[PDB]
Amino acid sequence: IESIIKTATDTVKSEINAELGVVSLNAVETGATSNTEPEEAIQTRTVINQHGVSETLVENFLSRAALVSKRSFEYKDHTSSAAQTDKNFFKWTINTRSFVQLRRKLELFTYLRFDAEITILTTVAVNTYMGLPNLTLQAMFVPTGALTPEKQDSFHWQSGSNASVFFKISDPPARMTIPFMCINSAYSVFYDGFAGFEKSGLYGINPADTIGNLCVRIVNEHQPVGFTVTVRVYMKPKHIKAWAPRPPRTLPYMSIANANYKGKKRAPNALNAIIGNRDSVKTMPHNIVT
Amino acid sequence: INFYKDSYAASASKQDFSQDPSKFTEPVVE
C-alpha cells in the first residue's frame, strides 16, 4: 500500500514468542521479499527512529549535475588542418552514456522522464603565454537528425528558430533547461528492439530517447595564436520520474551504443567473478585479530 | 524561485515522499 515515508520506521518493543501456528520463515519462490520484522525475529526494544530518507529520493539521487560531454578543440586558424578536426566548433549528439557514473545511475531504471538542466563550462589554454581571451561561444540546440553547421561561420548559426545560447568564458557557466522532450511519456533507458521498420537498424538505440544536439562554436574570429578550448557539458536531470529498477551494471562498459560486456580480467567485476575472491566460504575477509 | 514562464524550468522537486515498496517486495496476489 502506497504511503508517505519521510523517516525510517520505528521499532516496537517485543517479548518472548512460543506459538504453535503462524510464523522468520517465508516463501522465496513466490518472488516476494521476506516480510519478517525484527520484532518477530529477536526480542526488541522501542526505538523512535528519526532518520530521514530524503537523500535516497530518486529526485535527489539523480539530480546531480554530471559530466556528459568533454570536448577539447583547437581555437586557431584552420586553413590547413585535417578534415577530422573540430575547426573552431564541434557538434555533440547529447547522450547520457559516455561517462559511466551518470550512465550507471540512469541505467538503474528502465524508464526515466526528466527535464535536462544543461550546464556548459568552458576552459581555455594557450598553445609562450600572452593571456587568456574572454571568448564568446555559441551553443546551439539542434534536434536529433536535424541540420547542424558544417563550418564555424556557417549560416546555420543564425538561429532563426534553433535555440542558441551565447556565453563568455569569464562569465558563469552557461545554463539551460532542456525539457522532457520524448515523443513517449518516458525515455527508454533500455530499448529492447529496433527503431526502424527494416531489419538493419541499430539494436538498443531509440532516437526518441536522444535529447538532441549541442553544436558549440567559438563566435570569435581566430586569434593570431592558437588556443585549446575545452568545453565540458553537465547535465542535471530534474523533475524526475523513474520506473522499473534494474540490476546495476557490474561489468565495465565497453561502448556507448550498447550494453556489451567483457568484464575485468580478474575479480572483482570479471565475467565469471563479480565479487573479489576469498579463500573459502568459511574464510572471513577482514577478521578481527585478537 | 522561478521567474520563467515554463514549468519545466523550475528547480528540482525533492518533495515526493510517497513510497510503495510492496510493488517490488510483495508483488504477489494472495
Binding site: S34, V58, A273 | K5, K23
Partner: protein, 247 residues
Amino acid sequence: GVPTYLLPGSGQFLTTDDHSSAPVLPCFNPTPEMHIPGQVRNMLEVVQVESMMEINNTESAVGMERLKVDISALTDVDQLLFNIPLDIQLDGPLRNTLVGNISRYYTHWSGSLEMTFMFCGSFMATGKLILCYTPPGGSCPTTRETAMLGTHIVWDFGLQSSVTLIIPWISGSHYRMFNNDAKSTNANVGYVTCFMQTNLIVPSESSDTCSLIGFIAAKDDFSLRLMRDSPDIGQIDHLHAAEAAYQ
C-alpha cells in the same frame, strides 16, 4: 535601482545546486504522463528487495556457482558451513546486491538487514542449520557454541525452503560509515555464520550435495546518507563509439 552586493559563491557552479534555469524551448508542451508500472520515488524501495548474495566468492566457483553455497552431509557435529562478512559498504558477498550497490552510492547507513536463505536440495533432503549473527567486537566465531551466543535462527529445511535471519541494527552510532577501513568501530557490522545444527541427511537417490541460495535485503528502518560516486563502476578511457557522438 536595487543596491546589491555579490556574496562569496557568486558565479560558482556547484553540481548539487537547486535553481530554476532558462527554458531552451519556450511553450514546449511535454508528452502527457502515462501510467507506467513500477515507479520508484525513493531508492530505499529498491534496497528492500532481496537479492542474491555471492557467498561463494571463491576461486573455482565460476560465474553462477558463486551464487549458491553447496552443503554436504558431514560426519562431525556442530560444523561450520560458511560465513558472510557484513559491511555492505565494502566488497564481499553483499556488494553486488540491491542493498549493496545502492548503499555504495552512499557513505552512511543505518537500519536492519534481513538475510533469507533458500534451501535448494531435494524434497527428501532434511536437516537443521543455525544461522548466527554475531555483533562486532572480536574475531568471527568458528565453533557453533560460540556463535549461537549471538543472534541466531535455527532452521529445519525439511518442509521449509526458506528462513530469514534478521541482522538487527545494533550500533553505537546512529549510522555506520564507510571510510575504507573494514575494522573500524564505525564500520564493522559483525558476522553471519552458518553451522550444521543437525546434519544434511539425504536418501540414496537424492543428490548428496545440496545448495543454499542466500538473499539480503534491507528492512524499512534502513537509511542512507552522504551521497558519493560509486566505486563499482569506473573508466580510464572514453567508451567505444563515444567519439561518434561528435561526428
